[PDB]
């Protein structure tokens, strides 16, 4: 299976708007291979990665992630955003942390513009435990029992600057993938999709 | 200790004139602070001698113009004259080539190592300057952000002490 | 764009209880604390409370303390503040406004239009 | 029980001319956000951290200010500024300013 495993597809995308504000936080990531929000409407079916597709067949997982971000923007739209992770369960409340107290926590830098359109990204497995559960079965919230080994969050670096008669704002897409990866223990789960 | 810290930021305007100082910071004072987890090496050390080194970053849009400077001052400028900067260490932020900038300096300072309890007087002063005044069409983003970073190196202690608190 | 709703309120006799909603639109909610923030008919401002993320942390001025509730679901994208044992220095406008982070510092963004308590009898 | 203080209370200025107004505290404290209220509207982003701006603001205007004094500073007024303009702080008790009424002159 390491194949589809090893292959960056679609996770999320989310806008970037120039009205945004220096040191905000545009968006959260829970990082399993179980999430995906991405949805489209006719015909009816909803996104899920080639990861998400066959962890939610499994009972645990462990190794590295690979986040690949993509950016599309001009060559003269200009700005940096930032990736800042932050190790810890999934339930854990990271909406209070600064601009500063975040970039503490393990971080990098990327640059909109230039010949450079992919920042390939690696977070190393970071756990009190060899595995995560899967745990979106069983419903209520067990106290301990973690799947996403910390929220990662984007901020936004500095503003987004732009000449006047182009587009005001940059999507960008969120591959995802993994390397290293081992997993066992079947099952058959259809994952519904996370959404917010 | 040696990783990177976010530590001060403010937006660079048009109205600036000529060597309006947009920024004027200080190094040590602002990171021994409650904000950060390099906090708590600090916190219980009396002694410390460092080097240090920054990053500074803007984003001008290729159509802005412009230029700034940054120069590593230990003590202040006091009457040194403007016009001089360069010759500290130092590098020019040029909204044509380079966005980014790097300066590294050992320790500098007249006693043996920093006290951050009761600090004499600020070992590096943080001086940015605008170099070029910035010049606009029109409809472009007239404003561009401007960050700065730090890590100390070869950071060495001294002294351990609960009177920190 | 981002739309805030307040509802519910009114006249309210002392001693009477309340509880108000704000509803939120266009941005993803979960992902931002919230808060409400009474306006006195002088056009002075006072701070009354504040919800992290998720439920996680409650914060509260001392002058209401134990007497108001905030609360959250993220499902709807609407928030509740329950008030209990309120008294007249309690009327003013009241307005829901979303939290968000600076370099240093929390900052509101968008606020919404407010209801109005009035507590008297 | 940390408090701010706005010295002008109620302030008229015609078009054309500088303006200034200053939140003062009754300690020290690290930044100081500015809010804008204009008549039947909940008041506005407006100026946040310290001299940073809101997108939506024009150009035109400054602030400046550190450890217990700051100031808000408009370069040329026009009409359209006239509004309630409220300061604060995160430091400790989360506390406004007491408002500075800017009118046009005529």
């Known amino acids: 299976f390491t194949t589809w495993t090893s292959i960056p597809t679609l996770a999320a995308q989310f806008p970037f708007n120039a009205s945004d504000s220096v040191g905000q936080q545009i968006k959260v990531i829970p990082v399993d291979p179980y999430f995906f929000q991405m949805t489209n409407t006719n015909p009816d079916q909803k996104c899920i990665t080639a990861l998400a597709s066959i962890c939610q067949m499994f009972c645990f997982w462990r190794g590295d992630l690979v986040f690949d971000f993509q950016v599309f923007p001009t060559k003269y739209h200009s700005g940096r955003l930032l990736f800042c992770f932050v190790p810890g369960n999934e339930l854990i409340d990271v909406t209070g942390i600064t601009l500063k107290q975040a970039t503490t926590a393990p971080c990098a830098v990327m640059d909109i513009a230039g010949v450079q359109s992919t920042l390939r990204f690696r977070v190393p497995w970071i756990s009190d435990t060899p595995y995560r559960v899967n745990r979106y079965t069983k419903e209520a919230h067990q106290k301990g029992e973690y799947t996403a080994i910390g929220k990662l969050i984007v901020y936004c670096y500095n503003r987004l600057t732009s000449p006047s008669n182009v587009a005001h704002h940059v999507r960008v897409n969120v591959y995802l993938s993994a390397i290293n990866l081992e997993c066992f223990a079947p099952l058959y789960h259809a994952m519904d999709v996370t959404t917010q | 200790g040696e990783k990177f810290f976010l530590i001060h930021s403010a937006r660079w305007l048009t109205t600036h004139a000529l060597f309006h100082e947009v920024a004027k910071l200080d190094v040590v004072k602002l990171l021994y602070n409650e904000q950060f987890a390099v906090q708590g090496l600090l916190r219980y050390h009396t002694y410390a001698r460092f080097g240090i080194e920054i990053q500074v970053q803007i984003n001008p849009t290729p159509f802005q113009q412009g230029g700034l400077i940054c120069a590593m001052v230990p003590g202040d400028q006091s009457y040194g004259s403007i016009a001089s900067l360069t010759v500290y260490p130092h590098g020019l932020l040029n909204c044509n080539i380079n966005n980014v900038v790097r300066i590294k300096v050992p320790f500098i300072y007249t006693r043996g190592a920093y006290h951050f309890k009761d600090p004499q007087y600020p070992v590096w002063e943080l001086t940015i300057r605008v170099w070029s005044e910035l010049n606009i069409g029109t409809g472009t983003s007239a404003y561009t952000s401007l960050n700065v970073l730090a890590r100390f190196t070869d950071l060495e202690l001294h002294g351990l002490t609960p009177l920190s608190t | 764009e981002v739309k805030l709703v307040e509802s519910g309120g009114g006249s309210v006799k002392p001693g009477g209880s309340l509880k108000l909603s704000c509803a939120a639109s266009?941005?993803?909610?979960?992902?931002?604390?919230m808060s409400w923030v009474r306006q006195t008919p002088e056009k002075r401002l006072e701070w009354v409370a504040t919800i992290s993320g998720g439920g996680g942390y409650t914060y509260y001025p001392d002058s209401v303390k134990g007497r108001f509730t905030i609360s959250r679901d993220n499902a709807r994208n609407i928030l509740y503040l329950q008030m209990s044992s309120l008294r007249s220095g309690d009327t003013a406008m009241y307005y829901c406004?979303?939290?968000?982070?600076?370099?240093?510092?929390?900052?509101?963004?968008?606020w919404g239009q407010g209801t109005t308590l009035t507590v008297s009898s | 029980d940390i408090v701010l203080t706005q010295s002008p209370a109620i302030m008229s200025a015609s078009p054309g001319e500088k303006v200034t107004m200053t939140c003062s505290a009754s300690s020290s404290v690290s930044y100081i956000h500015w809010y804008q209220q204009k008549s039947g509207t909940s008041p506005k982003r407006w100026i946040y951290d310290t001299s940073r701006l809101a997108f939506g603001v024009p150009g035109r205007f400054s602030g400046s200010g550190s450890g217990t004094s700051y100031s808000l500073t408009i370069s040329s007024m026009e009409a359209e500024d006239a509004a309630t303009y409220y300061c604060?702080?995160?430091?400790?008790?989360?506390?406004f300013g007491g408002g500075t009424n800017l009118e046009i002159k005529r």
């Open positions: 266009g941005f993803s909610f979960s992902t931002y604390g």
């Open positions: 406004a979303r939290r968000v982070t600076t370099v240093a510092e929390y900052y509101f963004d968008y």
């Open positions: 604060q702080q995160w430091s400790s008790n989360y506390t």
